[PDB]
Amino acid sequence: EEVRQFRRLFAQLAGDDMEVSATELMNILNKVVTRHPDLKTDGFGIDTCRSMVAVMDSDTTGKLGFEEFKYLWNNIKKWQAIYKQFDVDRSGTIGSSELPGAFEAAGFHLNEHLYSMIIRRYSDEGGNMDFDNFISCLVRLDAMFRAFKSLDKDGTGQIQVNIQEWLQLTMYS
Amino acid sequence: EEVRQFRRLFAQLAGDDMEVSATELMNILNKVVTRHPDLKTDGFGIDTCRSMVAVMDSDTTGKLGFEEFKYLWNNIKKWQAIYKQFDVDRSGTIGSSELPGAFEAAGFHLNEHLYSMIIRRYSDEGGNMDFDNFISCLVRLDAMFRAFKSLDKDGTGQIQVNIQEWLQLTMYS
Numbered sequence: 412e413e414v415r416q417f418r419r420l421f422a423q424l425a426g427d428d429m430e431v432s433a434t435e436l437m438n439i440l441n442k443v444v445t446r447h448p449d450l451k452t453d454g455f456g457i458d459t460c461r462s463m464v465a466v467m468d469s470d471t472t473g474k475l476g477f478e479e480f481k482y483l484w485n486n487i488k489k490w491q492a493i494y495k496q497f498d499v500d501r502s503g504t505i506g507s508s509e510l511p512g513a514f515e516a517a518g519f520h521l522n523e524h525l526y527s528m529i530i531r532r533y534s535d536e537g538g539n540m541d542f543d544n545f546i547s548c549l550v551r552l553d554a555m556f557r558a559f560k561s562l563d564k565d566g567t568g569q570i571q572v573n574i575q576e577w578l579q580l581t582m583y584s
Numbered sequence: 585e586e587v588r589q590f591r592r593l594f595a596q597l598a599g600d601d602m603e604v605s606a607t608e609l610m611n612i613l614n615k616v617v618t619r620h621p622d623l624k625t626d627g628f629g630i631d632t633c634r635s636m637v638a639v640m641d642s643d644t645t646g647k648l649g650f651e652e653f654k655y656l657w658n659n660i661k662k663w664q665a666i667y668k669q670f671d672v673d674r675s676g677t678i679g680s681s682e683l684p685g686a687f688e689a690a691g692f693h694l695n696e697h698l699y700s701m702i703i704r705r706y707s708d709e710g711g712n713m714d715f716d717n718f719i720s721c722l723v724r725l726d727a728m729f730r731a732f733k734s735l736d737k738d739g740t741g742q743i744q745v746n747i748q749e750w751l752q753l754t755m756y757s
């Protein structure tokens with residue numbers, strides 16, 4: 412029944428081409444946040460959604476098919492739950508001091524240098540990250556872990572990236 | 585002469601803290617576009633401006649110093665001229681058949697496969713790319729070429745990276 416209700420909701424979200432475009436994704440993400448007053452956000456903008464589509468578009472059709480959209484949606488749900496749980500002052504945002512505990516609850520255990528870099532690149536002047544920034548960040552972080560893993564065949568902790576693959580991975584994202 | 589003019593322009597834009605923030609950049613670019621009606625754009629938004637700054641921020645200050653801003657600004661001017669010239673139909677946007685001409689004038693040679701990915705990420709449903717996306721795409725592309733080159737100084741066409749280095753290189757919105 413859980414499977415059946417979700418299949419139906421994808422069909423309603425994707426429309427006749429049975430894929431979710433960046434614009435489509437934007438409108439449903441914004442409808443979601445409207446329902447959660449505990450999530451502070453300046454909204455999901457079109458370019459952030461284009462990035463999320465690209466990074467999750469493994470079959471390169473330009474849009475999210477059922478399995479791609481399922482994977483992303485279920486990640487957003489789990490990370491939404493985490494954002495709420497680690498926003499302990501109820502600011503609606505993930506502060507610098509909340510961020511490590513949240514990334515780690517999402518299964519991404521980094522280090523001091525890498526957290527600093529994330530806040531520098533993703534958080535605002537006050538070191539705070541709102542909900543669309545946190546989602547955009549994790550979608551990419553998850554993807555980059557998955558891409559390193561796909562490339563690390565022999566399990567050695569070191570990958571070898573050619574220019575073409577570099578370009579593909581960084582630009583279609 | 586023109587050298588002291590630009591040094592003073594930087595000083596004026598950077599203001600009190602002597603560096604250019606994502607916000608200051610957003611404000612000067614948006615005022616730039618408003619004085620070229622031939623340059624179609626939905627505007628330079630915070631995500632795009634925070635993301636240009638991040639890729640240009642070589643010294644991890646979170647803001648653009650003189651040399652960083654200069655490199656960025658001079659590229660933007662060069663690319664703006666290319667955009668106007670390669671928009672041969674005067675649609676005010678760079679269409680899929682105009683894009684390879686433009687990128688070649690900018691010094692970039694890419695295979696069809698990578699154009700198709702770039703078009704899907706940065707252009708609309710008709711294949712037409714607006715000015716802020718064009719600039720955002722070129723800034724990223726040049727930055728990725730430079731990051732790769734620095735780690736491949738013998739020109740093998742391949743770099744070798746551990747997970748820490750990989751997140752540092754790729755975690756750019």
Ligand SMILES: [Ca+2]
Nearest residue numbers: 425426428430
């Ligand atoms: Ca659709």
Ligand SMILES: [Ca+2]
Nearest residue numbers: 468472474476
């Ligand atoms: Ca797809």
Ligand SMILES: [Ca+2]
Nearest residue numbers: 498502504506
């Ligand atoms: Ca908080």
Ligand SMILES: [Ca+2]
Nearest residue numbers: 453541543544
């Ligand atoms: Ca935001």
Ligand SMILES: [Ca+2]
Nearest residue numbers: 598599601603
């Ligand atoms: Ca300043």
Ligand SMILES: [Ca+2]
Nearest residue numbers: 641645647649
């Ligand atoms: Ca800097």
Ligand SMILES: [Ca+2]
Nearest residue numbers: 671675677679
């Ligand atoms: Ca055109």
Ligand SMILES: [Ca+2]
Nearest residue numbers: 626714716717
């Ligand atoms: Ca745009």
